[PDB]
């Protein structure tokens, strides 16, 4: 209660996401995605911040089976423009830096500053760990690339904010809670995430979508999954604008039901203002 | 003759490499970026990249990183994940008190946990659990991991096909450095491609119309956000066929009318696993 679980360690971007999307809430680090969900299921946390999409690259969990099983429900989403800081020890400076420690992907994103300062790349497991290691070692020669939060929590100094050579990466998250008794009341500005299955024949998916197109309903995400021991059908996770008990989505879903099987609502939640921000 | 994979020795990805390319030296890499880098740099011929799981699993996002390493999907592989209960040399089922494995695996083997009255101890992955059980001398600790993990860590298999409650199958892309030409037109091929359509109702629907009426069957489809730009959406699509042969050839020309920046990520044989009971 007032606790939000996330996957990773303190100062991870997921941690920052929690503090961005729910300021004042205590964040609960979990090492595994399964533990993150388990925290909410068991009552150790109210919410879970689960990564779902990255514009460039990232590690995201497969929620298609695990989330409905043990009965979570997407009650929100959150967008994060990932901001890389170059972190050093309290008394350090840019000139001291010789070796740079961070995640493989981050290292690619900051190739400019590596060449600029002539640094030696040292790839670590994640960004938060690189921040922790730089603190632990106490060497001014070693710097980290990690979140500004990782600097705060480990008492490191920010040698430079915004080290990305371009905007590069944005991360989208689902915010999941224990399944609520009723859905949010019909209204504008809602999103809906659902599962459905169609057969393995040419226009099977196409048909299922027909009702969405002619009804003017816009899809924001779609992703297919294999079925265990069957190549005869295919399951889909779909994000669509709207609320299932309000037009124009309500009728569109009735049509979808005619051309699909085992439809299931994973979440009905407010669409983030980030979607309409320049 | 070297194939890179993500994980540590005895991981199911490692087993996949040995299944799909027997006799090839496998190159463990800790990160997905390192796995692709190995092929880009010439440290490996191929890369075994996990792409799908029927139940659950950790898969990389290849949509940007793979084309940008200049790689190209030249094959696929399906693996029915087979869990072995592993103990230290000379141990037995009776000795076992604690059981170590990945969260998902632990769920799949709830039967044997209750059967032997074991204490579940969840680890990061299966290969690590095998390594830990070896490292710790202790007959009280057993692992659930691949048969390969047992071999490479000198552990004994206490039971070979530990029944899963709900089984898992893992699908992989096999990527190499972009070849000069495509495989010659013929039957049994699959094609993976990237395309973009606009953020309007029916945009995707239109792009697919040409596939449906042309009798071309899709096996996978997955959307991605575009950095900044909230105006279009990129898709990865697996479809049956070869882009220089009907019925796919013409279907793709139509798809091009309703989409942008079409790109072939791979053209590769469809695994016999797709038609196996
Ligand atoms: N094979 C079906 C369903 C499907 C669509 C897309 C991806 C995977 C499966 C079709 O072509 O419509
Ligand atoms: N929004 C477009 C394309 C799209 C589909 C699915 C996910 C994202 C984008 C449509 O409704 O057809």
Numbering used by the authors:
A (entry chain B): 4 to 281
B (entry chain A): 5 to 281
Authors' description from the paper:
We solved and refined the native GqqA three-dimensional structure to 2.5 Å resolution, utilizing SAD phases obtained from a truncated and Se modified version of GqqA. DLS and SAXS measurements indicated a GqqA dimer in solution, which is also present in the crystal structure with a rather extended interface area of approx. 2230 Å2 between the monomers. A GqqA monomer itself consists of three domains. The N-terminal and middle domain of GqqA consist of a mixed five-stranded β-sheet with three parallel strands, surrounded by three α-helices. The C-terminal ACT domain is formed by a four-stranded anti-parallel β-sheet and two helices. The symmetry related mate of the ACT domain complements an extended central β-sheet structure of the functional homodimer. In the C-terminal regions of both monomers within the dimer interface we identified two L-Phe molecules. The PBP domain is folded into two structurally similar subdomains which form a cleft for the putative active site. Docking studies applying the native GqqA structure and the potential substrate N-octanoyl-L-homoserine lactone suggest that the lactone ring most probably binds to the polar residues Y16, S17 and T174 located in the cleft typical for the subdomains of PDT. According to this data the GqqA crystal structure we analysed corresponds to a closed conformation.
